[PDB]
């Protein structure tokens, strides 16, 4: 029986990063539930011209895009997380770390989240923006 | 002439240009784009350094970095619409400040309808 003070933006952001990458390994077919119809999502990749791949919107495309990336036994090493309160009770999250897919080599990345309160259930957060870029594809 | 409101990608890309100009023609004027709730960090290992809030605390940290002879290479700018017609901007680049090594960096802006709500800058060499 314990009431504590409300979660700081850091706790929210760092705790979301723990759940995000954990879900990305265990069950990435569940990841889309945290995105709404306004949400944006990109996760690296290139195109026919070697230019960084494009972003998708809405839970429907976001799920379809997440499943095309074949997240298989993803291993993650997170090196730093900032999370600062932003406008409209949102939280902006900058994540710097290393990620592997299909037991391949770890690759450095930069990632930006905007999390916002879901607005209809107490203490519920959804992802309004997911910007993930591997560093080897830009540098 | 009246033109359609610029897409986010256009706003962030133009903001990055305007940002790193003023970073090297008048870093003193940079605090004017911030507000009372704005947060700012620009790398640094204190003994990763903490963020400061409010325009005066931002103006003071900006001086401490002694920006001059800034050569910036911007390899990628992402920018999307976020909460309340705001723009979140992710910058990946290189920065050389006053005749020093050119270092990979990662920056995250949140622009609100334009004023800066958050400015988060990390050098990779202080993190990896």
Swiss-Prot record, chain A:
List each copy of the NTF2 domain by range.
12-134
Q: Tell me where the cross-link Glycyl lysine isopeptide (Lys-Gly) (interchain with G-Cter in ubiquitin) is found.
A: 37, 51, 60, 65, 77, 124
Q: In which tissues is it expressed?
A: Ubiquitous.
Concerning PTM, the database record says: Phosphorylation of the acidic disordered region regulates stress granule assembly. Dephosphorylation after HRAS activation is required for stress granule assembly. Ubiquitinated by TRIM21 via 'Lys-63'-linked polyubiquitination in the NTF2 domain in response to heat shock, leading to stress granule disassembly: ubiquitination promotes interaction with the FAF2 adapter, followed by interaction with VCP, which extracts G3BP1 from stress granules, leading to stress granule disassembly. In case of prolonged stress, ubiquitination by TRIM21 leads to autophagy-dependent degradation of G3BP1 via recruitment of ubiquitinated G3BP1 by SQSTM1 and/or CALCOCO2 to autophagosomes.
Signal sequence bounds: none
Query: Where, per UniProt, does this protein localize?
Result: Cytoplasm, Cytosol; Perikaryon; Cytoplasm, Stress granule; Nucleus
Which consequence is recorded for altering residue 133 to I? Found in a patient with a neurodevelopmental disorder; uncertain significance; decreased function in stress granule formation shown by rescue assays in transfected G3BP1-deficient cells
Q: What does this protein do?
A: Protein involved in various processes, such as stress granule formation and innate immunity. Plays an essential role in stress granule formation. Stress granules are membraneless compartments that store mRNAs and proteins, such as stalled translation pre-initiation complexes, in response to stress. Promotes formation of stress granules phase-separated membraneless compartment by undergoing liquid-liquid phase separation (LLPS) upon unfolded RNA-binding: functions as a molecular switch that triggers RNA-dependent LLPS in response to a rise in intracellular free RNA concentrations.
Q: What is recorded about the protein's domains?
A: Can mediate both protein-protein and protein-RNA interactions via the NTF2 domain and RNA-binding domain RRM; protein-protein and protein-RNA interactions are essential for undergoing liquid-liquid phase separation (LLPS). The acidic disordered region acts as a negative regulator of phase separation.
Q: How does it assemble?
A: Homodimer and oligomer. Component of a TAU mRNP complex, at least composed of IGF2BP1, ELAVL4 and G3BP1. Binds to the SH3 domain of Ras GTPase-activating protein (RASA1) in proliferating cells. No interaction in quiescent cells. Interacts (via NTF2 domain) with USP10; inhibiting stress granule formation by lowering G3BP1 valence. Interacts (via NTF2 domain) with CAPRIN1; promoting stress granule formation by lowering the saturation-concentration of G3BP1. Interacts (via NTF2 domain) with UBAP2L; promoting stress granule formation. Associates (via RG-rich region) with 40S ribosome subunits. (Microbial infection) Interacts with Semliki forest virus non-structural protein 3 (via C-terminus); this interaction inhibits the formation of stress granules on viral mRNAs and the nsp3-G3BP1 complexes bind viral RNAs and probably orchestrate the assembly of viral replication complexes.
- Protein name (Swiss-Prot/TrEMBL): Ras GTPase-activating protein-binding protein 1
Source lineage: Eukaryota, Metazoa, Chordata, Craniata, Vertebrata
